[PDB]
């Protein structure tokens, strides 16, 4: 059951009904671990019959927003503001995209929509979407293009110095100001480089469990957890248990960090 | 009297006159607990024979200001700068609202005022208002309209997976970029979801006592207390004692969090 | 009235009936700040119509006990275990000491009873006793004896490099293994030496208010507060306000630490 | 000589030459304690033979700059950028203000220059000047003007609820976006209100010593010390010793905090 | 080889291959210690066959960028954006710079390039460069000019109050909004002044080792380490070991801090 | 060689010669992590030509000692004071046991010596062993016998609710008050129960590397590290890397906790 | 004047008289930094007319006491309790030792007296003695003897793995259960091993200044400073400045650490 654990985490919110105030969530100066018992769902404007929960916004200091969209019966999507690029990823259910030709996106599929590119996502039953939105940073006369596909369909890439498996969802072309990485770790595998860089992250754990290190903090995590990594926060991960770990990742690229 | 412990708190400033520099007030990175012994009142500009005490201003990262106005005899309110929406809530006493057909606002009464909408607040004896102001965020081709009412004359809304009785002094319409909630709790009741949302709050405890959690901090609170909650700060509350707890709450809405 | 606020503190427990869990009390590794709303009163074994509250006992690492005894109509004191000396200071009310004569100990009156010294304190109306007990550390063929006097009848002692007024209740003779000091500070005066010594303390603030520094902590204190000071806890004090400060203080002496 | 310890602290930088890396200075999120052994003097741009040291600049989130100007012989002041108002207070030595009849400014003297107001400070011997500069907040037609004077000749203002003696160096007119206060505390006195306000500060302790509370931090202070107070930082002060306390204080006013 | 350790740290990143997640790197609110096991290299845009690792960017609250650039065979640089000034220092290898003229830069050689000044770096074998870039702050009608030199050809400068040996790679004329200092400490030497200034820093320990204090933090440092010093953070260094300590240091200057 | 990495940790003291004062060791209230760069070797009393270093003694609160004896050429051992049971475990080299029989002990070989049980240890070449000495608690008439062995020659015991391979070196029979568990985890495997018990530990990681949790502190560890776990200190382990993970563990058993 | 700064420290107690509550002293769970402004001089028990200030006693968990003796005109020592060994070191002045023939002990001189060894130190001018006392841990039939010497007359000892110059005032015989090391560091030198041993210390920096690490605490120190290091606390040092560093050091040896 692909990404099942992501929408049905082992430690579920209802399990803390007799533990008032308790939460695994934390929000600090340079990072954050947002968990299922803290998601605040509420109707998404311009969207039709869709409860959405924002996990990250520029108020945190980011240049993107990362939210979860719960599309229920005969739901439709609203358009991002002007000059806002959007990326959706289906983690549960099914949704159909329409502008050049129709597309039926299911679990593990995804779509990238450039700024002001007209489109619409129409869902008949339900679909859990983890979407990233950003004010597109126009470089020269470059323009991004529509992108559609699936994680499994993407090729494995060079992971010099590392051992985790890496897939990328978007073109690395200079026009794209960000990308989405899918990283896989086998139990016992970790990051050799204790990353400290100007790039910022938005991460969703799709499968597995392990320990994430953020700054001087150590956080045991499980599929379903979300993470906000501000630029320059020391970061690291290690997968644990019997099943492997898989996480979806946001990362800004191709722009002078000045 | 209605909301008497808000203006005459069980533990008052005069009760600490022998505990040098002692205060319950805390101003942290993502939140604040402003207790009565820290309130700073100074002549409120343009107003008349009225002292004001700013509790929250954008200097904290918010996008709004919160202050207590203590109107004295033969007093009158001043006007907000240009393009600024204002909202007053009567915590004690009486005050007349003129534009028109003048209106009489008493304890638990209130009024919203579109940005610029010319209005005048005039009071005879005394009166103490809790007020919010924020530079309106014009949603393209939308506008709001003068609102007036009394908490009690507001219907109890639906609160799924939550017990507290909710009321909203303003319309959930798109025009409005913020609302004002009235959440009542019964001794022993708390918030089931440990919230983490882009939304920000400014809240006044009118009745009751309980425990508020903010980030990894827990704070015993009594009526009269005011809390500042910045975007994404984990929050939670539980009412205690014999009476019920109820607080005033500003919450930003109907605007993209980008 | 003398030592009035000592039993009627500015901030009283009832003033906190609306702040669940709130408390000024703090019990740390090398010290403690016991305040009114934490006093645990229970009937004093071997006593009559007398509730007692223990503030410090060797469970803290000390070598003595400190406690308050609220005596009431027709009440009497019980004989302290074998080989244990006792010192009683009358905070309020009246009590009669018998044994070889019988003195009428009133407010500001004290009595040191040697170990195994038959005696009895008997209160008819009501008395508040602050008392110290310790296993006496027998030296040579030295032995102590009954001491009965009043603070005002003790000469002011000069203390080099310090500006506080000092009175020592018991004789400085080698035989006594401790002494009770009375220390007065005028508003604005403070300890010039930032003490760090093997000596351990137990103190009760009878009058005034100020800042007490213990270790790396700063505590606002008012009359009625009690403090535990384990050996070597860095300590300092400053008197604030209109009125002067006065605290009763236990201090072990004349015994070689080896 | 007036404010002698202000430029000759009891605990001088020299006394610390056998303690590598030691400093009393601290810089936190909402406040700062800048002490002598931390001042970094550098030649002051556009000034003649004048060493300067910036203690506070907008890099802290403030809207004003605060610096010390050590003027030696034949030294001259330097005009500030466009739209910047300047306030100079003489702490040691003497300088001549010329622009409307030259003026000799000595210790305790001060001058306020409206933005874009041509002037010149010429010194022939030496002089220490504490100066504040800001981007004036033009409010309609209102405009400030040259203000020369002395603290002694300024009237003792009254402050409800407090006992400290206050004087405000500049007019309270709405045109002025801030004032400079002088506050006196007799030993044993302290602030009654545990201030928490939108206003921000920058201060210089000219005389005396005491304890300053900032947030949950406590700092013993002495003449010569400088403090930064960010908006909404919990603040409290107490004077101690034989001599009285005196500190210069910056404070913004007459401008909507919204 | 000059600066050999700065390229081959005593404690190399691989020495830590059996310590999962362990790193000596810290990114605090007002400073940062970036070490080798955390460096993140990636294809430097617009460059040719050169890996880069940004250490500091305006995302930390700075106004500049600092990055290590690993130029391999037949490698060439890329031009910075409009108005971005640039400074490069050779810590390893050799590279050629061309217009006005052309020079062969080897270890210890540097070149400052004014805004929009067309240039180019070309390396045949390998080179390691530490570089700083910044949005130039045009002051009036002034302009900077090409500066190419060698650390050793720079004269020792007077360090009033200090004992280290300071060189400045760039001129001090008002046109330059920054400079790069070279600071040498003999073993056991340290900074007498415990700096607190608006100037922000970017350093690279070229050789030696010792201790660095940043705020209330203390860090053992070795050649290769990199430190970020945001404005006003208290700073201090002491050199230890057999050999001397040398560190490259950026510093903003000749601009009003308002 | 076996356990080689333990005697030659990947991160060794030599790698730290350029980081003054730096050390990975931590000694806390309820636990400790002793690393190779903090070992203090001194000639063991009674022993012959043999450097020894104690890692855990009762000064820490334990009721046992643990140390590393590094027997050199022609070395011999000394006996434990009256009633001090002793267990040795060869970590590297060779040494012969004597006195019944006379078997030469080698790497991965151990020996329990009953209290007073006369014995000897002579090493011809080199030897490094880890020993545990303690005051035996006679439980009536029961008594311990000599024991010699090897790890692999020990039955892999079961472990209800666990995955780590377990082996004990001594009889679980009541006569013994302490055992020496051996534990093995495969990369990605971890303790399922966050242990909290009266028992105390003294461990040596012989192989692997992972993350150890002690209370609220997490520690990246590697072969050769040493940990002390006082009673009730919350503990947890997880192995990482390509190789397995194993450690030697002390543990009091079969005795009333009162 | 040998060790002049040891009783006339650069940062003197009187330099901090305008800083109420300020002190450099610290006292924690495993260590302590006792500075001059905290010395509590008070009549020494048994001694005749001599002020003394205890720095360390077993109350801290140690097995020895450390204290300063201020002897003046005609003032003499008092035999210590029974079975207590004493060691005195002359830091200032001179004192005569008698009991075999009298001996004049000047600065840098010392005397170790066995337990019960009758004797007496008398003074006719002035002298500052740093003394250590402990309840001698008799072992078998071993006994100690009157030791009298002088630092300079003691030989440098082999310091493998180090560079500091070491001297031991007492014989290394298994009889002595403690020794007093003299350790000298040249500017820049430091400990290579970050010790963590069962041994305990009581040190007194006699000459110079530097940085001292204890646990995760970093401390600047100067001549006259006194440090207490409890068993197993991480400890390191580094000498800084123009002049060398030297400190006296108590260290227990020759006894099973069980
Ligand atoms: N925290 C991370 O996992 N970061 C990724 N390795 C990345 O930035 O590519
Ligand atoms: N603090 C609160 O009461 N928050 C509300 N539950 C809200 O944000 O809707
Ligand atoms: N803290 C104190 O009260 N100290 C007293 N001066 C004392 O130890 O005598
Ligand atoms: N902290 C302060 O000194 N506050 C001043 N009394 C003031 O705000 O006026
Ligand atoms: N950290 C430093 O070394 N700073 C330099 N002394 C400087 O700012 O000039
Ligand atoms: N820390 C440990 O691994 N403890 C073992 N599981 C044990 O006590 O058996
Ligand atoms: N902290 C110390 O100075 N330790 C000494 N080197 C010692 O234990 O010998
Ligand atoms: Mn990353
Ligand atoms: Mn909320
Ligand atoms: Mn004391
Ligand atoms: Mn203020
Ligand atoms: Mn600097
Ligand atoms: Mn265990
Ligand atoms: Mn040591």
UniProtKB/Swiss-Prot annotation, chains A, B, C, D, E, F, G:
> Which classification does the entry list for the species?
Eukaryota, Viridiplantae, Streptophyta, Embryophyta, Tracheophyta
Q: Where does substrate bind?
A: 195, 235, 247, 251
Gene3D superfamilies on file: Jelly Rolls
Q: What cellular component terms from Gene Ontology apply here?
A: cytosol; endoplasmic reticulum
**UniProt family annotation:** Belongs to the UGHY family.
Q: Which Pfam families match?
A: Cupin_2 (PF07883)
**Impact after mutating residue 197 to A:** Loss of activity
Task: Give me any GO biological process, just one.
Answer: purine nucleobase catabolic process
| Major site of localization recorded for this protein | endoplasmic reticulum
Obligatory cofactor(s):
Mn(2+)
Q: Which UniProt keywords apply?
A: Endoplasmic reticulum, Hydrolase, Manganese, Metal-binding, Purine metabolism, Signal
Q: How does it assemble?
A: Homooctamer.
First-level EC class: hydrolase
**Where is the Cupin type-2 domain positioned along the sequence?**
182-248
Q: Tell me the protein's name.
A: (S)-ureidoglycine aminohydrolase
The scientific name of the source species is Arabidopsis thaliana
Q: Where does Mn(2+) bind?
A: 195, 197, 201, 235
Q: Which superkingdom does the taxonomy of this entry point to?
A: Eukaryota
Instruction: Quote the EC number.
Output: 3.5.3.26
Question: One MF term from GO for this chain?
Answer: ureidoglycine aminohydrolase activity
Q: Which InterPro entries match?
A: Cupin_2, RmlC-like_jellyroll, RmlC_Cupin_sf, UGHY, UGlyAH_cupin_C, UGlyAH_cupin_N
